[PDB]
Amino acid sequence: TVTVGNQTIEVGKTMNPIVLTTVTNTVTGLPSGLSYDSATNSIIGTPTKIGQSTVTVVSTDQANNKSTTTFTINVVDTTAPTVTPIGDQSSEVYSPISPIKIATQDNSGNAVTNTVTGLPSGLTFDSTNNTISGTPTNIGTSTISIVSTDASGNKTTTTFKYEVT
Amino acid sequence: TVTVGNQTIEVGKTMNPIVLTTVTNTVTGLPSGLSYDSATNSIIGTPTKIGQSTVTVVSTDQANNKSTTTFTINVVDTTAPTVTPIGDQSSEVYSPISPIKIATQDNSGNAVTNTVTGLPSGLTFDSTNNTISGTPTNIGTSTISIVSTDASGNKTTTTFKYEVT
Ligand SMILES: [Ca+2]
Ligand SMILES: [Ca+2]
């Protein structure tokens, strides 16, 4: 058997090393974030860009006899964004609130979209600065729900209670 | 692990099929004598030329997503020549013999060298037509020894008795 197909790895995570097995290997075309460890004949590191790369191994044996393999690594994003926790909130009706920042992070290098719902009346969400602000118009309790989506469509849902008094 | 190095196979023999495993594979650069069996995702056949070939698999999955592996096949000769059997011989001293042809065959496409020794006196070997002829000058028994060598240095030894009466 010869192994064909993608070698699939997760962007922004430290990969399981890929062992090269049958000698001197010469590896090229590696994505940023990865390189080749002679001493373990392993490709290791953490890839930073989503996409496919075609990697070339030229191997030389003890008599300097040349050989060539190439294969594809596929760097994917299948992990959801993270969101800094937001505690339960309380403020007085008719008073402008201190803005609440939704801080998000993602294993991809990239921007995250937040969809916010269940907001107390009078309050609003600004997608440019990703903050909740405004002036509550009703007393009562709300559950504020945030769906954060990375560029590859992975979603996280975060909730917190808003209490207006 | 990714498999690196030569895939080594024997010239003029029917290979163990190489299974391609992880889909539509597109195979190219195969040596003469081999091709790709879709239904088994196997490379099969019998190679005829000694040497290295670099073979390319482009695989397409169910969503038509492209992938690439390449590897080297190394077609070697490690098998000795064969020689048509020659029976024990008898002829009269002072009489020219009917020439004896040494017929050889080899799994490589190529020429074989025969080294002949232990010949009864008066007899000789012609390397161009590969035949023993001449006129025996002594009565007695000889053991005639033939070393046949292929182009890769694989050797077979064949013997037969010559009786001069
Ligand atoms: Ca992600
Ligand atoms: Ca041979």
Author numbering:
A (entry chain A), B (entry chain A): 120 to 141, 149 to 291
Lines quoted from the article behind this entry:
To further investigate the plasticity of these junctions, we determined three crystal structures for each of two consecutive modules: L-lectin&β-GF (Phe245–Lys575), β-GF&CDHL-1 (Ser494–Thr663), and CDHL-1&2 (Ala576–Asn751). We superimposed each of these three structures over the corresponding two modules of the full-length SraPBR structure, always with the C-terminal modules aligned. The results revealed slight twisting and/or translation with intermodule angle changes of 9.4°, 11.7° and 14.6° for the three junctions, respectively. In detail, residues Val496-Gln498 in L-lectin&β-GF, Phe571&Thr572 in β-GF&CDHL-1, and Asp661-Thr663 in CDHL-1&2 undergo slight conformational changes. Except for a short disordered segment at the N-terminus of CDHL-1&2 due to the deletion of two Ca-2 coordinate residues Asp573 and Lys575, we did not find secondary-structure change in any module pairs. The C-terminal tandem repeat of two modules share a sequence identity of 56% and a similar overall structure with an RMSD of 0.81 Å over 81 Cα atoms. In contrast, each CDHL module in SraPBR binds to only a single Ca2+ that does not superimpose on any of the three Ca2+ ions in eukaryotic cadherins. Unlike the monomeric form of SraPBR, the recombinant CDHL1&2 exists as a dimer in solution as confirmed by size-exclusion chromatography and chemical cross-linking assays. CDHL-2 from one subunit packs against the junction between CDHL-1 and CDHL-2 from the symmetric subunit, and vice versa. The interface is mainly stabilized by polar interactions, in contrast to the hydrophobic dimeric interfaces of eukaryotic cadherins.
S. aureus encodes a 2,271-residue SRRP termed serine-rich adhesin for binding to platelets (SraP), that is involved in the pathogenesis of infective endocarditis. S. aureus SraP, a surface-exposed serine-rich repeat glycoprotein (SRRP), is required for the pathogenesis of human infective endocarditis via its ligand-binding region (BR) adhering to human platelets. We determine the 2.05 Å crystal structure of SraPBR, revealing a rod-like tandem organization of four discrete modules: a legume lectin-like module, a module with a β-grasp fold, and two tandem cadherin-like modules that create the rigid stem of SraPBR. Further structural and biochemical analyses reveal that the legume lectin-like module specifically binds to N-acetylneuraminic acid (Neu5Ac), which may mediate adhesion to host sialylated receptors.
